[PDB]
Amino acid sequence: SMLEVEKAKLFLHKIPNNVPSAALAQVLSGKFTLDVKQAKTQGRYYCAFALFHSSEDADQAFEHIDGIEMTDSLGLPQKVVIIKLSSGSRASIYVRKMVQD
């Protein structure tokens, strides 16, 4: 049942440190909770996990994400989505499913 929790997770990463993690909720739909990981020492980016109630809700939310669909070198489908920052600045963050089976 650990896997069904994991299949309900989206992985948000390459997030610049100037992005407040609460702003990550603006690019996701549905009902989820965000678990933010601390940036490494002298690190510039951080990542977060969005946990939904099921893999179906996670898949539904990932499809709803407004972002460019791409494939990384590992062959994983990922979406590049723009975060509108209150400073008029912006950030590109990457979103993919946690489990790629």
Numbering used by the authors: 308 to 408
Paste lines from the article.
To better understand its structure and function, we conducted crystallographic studies and obtained crystals of the SDN1 CTD (residues 309–409) with mutations in three glutamic acid residues (E329A/E330A/E332A). In the CTD structure, residues 315–409 adopts a βαββαβββ RNA Recognition Motif (RRM) fold, but the N-terminal first α helix (residues 309–314) belongs to the linker connecting the DEDDh and RRM domains. In the SDN1 RRM structure, the six-stranded, antiparallel β sheet forms a positively charged surface and packs against two α-helices. Sequence similarities between SDN1 RRM and other RRM proteins are very low, but two aromatic amino acids that are usually crucial for RNA binding in RRM family members are present in SDN1 RRM (Phe318 in β1 and Phe356 in β3). Mapping all these residues onto the RRM surface reveals that they are mainly located on the antiparallel β sheet (β1, β3, β4, β5, and β6), which is positively charged. Interestingly, NMR titration showed that Phe318 on β1 of SDN1 RRM interacts with RNA, but no large change in chemical shift was observed for Phe356, suggesting that Phe356 may not be involved in RNA binding. Another feature of SDN1 RRM is that its extended β4 and β5 participate in RNA binding (residues Thr378, Asp379, Gly382, and Gln385 detected via NMR titration), whereas most canonical RRMs consist of very short or no β4 and β5. Unlike many RRMs, which exhibit strong substrate binding affinities (in the nM range) and sequence specificities, SDN1 RRM binds RNA weakly in a sequence independent mode. Moreover, canonical RRMs usually fold into a βαββαβ topology, while our structural and NMR titration studies show that SDN1 RRM is composed of a six-stranded antiparallel β sheet with the unconventional extension of β4 and β5, and the two extended β strands are involved in RNA binding. Despite its low RNA binding affinity, the RRM domain is critical to the overall RNA binding affinity and processive enzyme activity of SDN1 by working cooperatively with the DEDDh domain—while the DEDDh domain attacks the 3′ end of an ssRNA, the RRM binds the 5′ region of the RNA.
In this study, we solved the structure of SDN1, an exonuclease that initiates miRNA degradation by trimming their 3′ ends to generate unmethylated miRNAs that can be further turned over. Arabidopsis SDN1 and SDN2 belong to the DEDD 3′→5′ exonuclease superfamily, characterized by an active core consisting of three separate sequence motifs with four invariant acidic amino acids (DEDD). The Arabidopsis SDN family belongs to the DEDDh subfamily. Our structural and biochemical studies revealed the structural features of SDN1 in substrate recognition and provided insights on how SDN1 uses its DEDDh catalytic domain and the RRM domain cooperatively to degrade free small RNAs and trim miRNAs in miRNA/target RNA duplexes or miRNAs bound by AGO1.
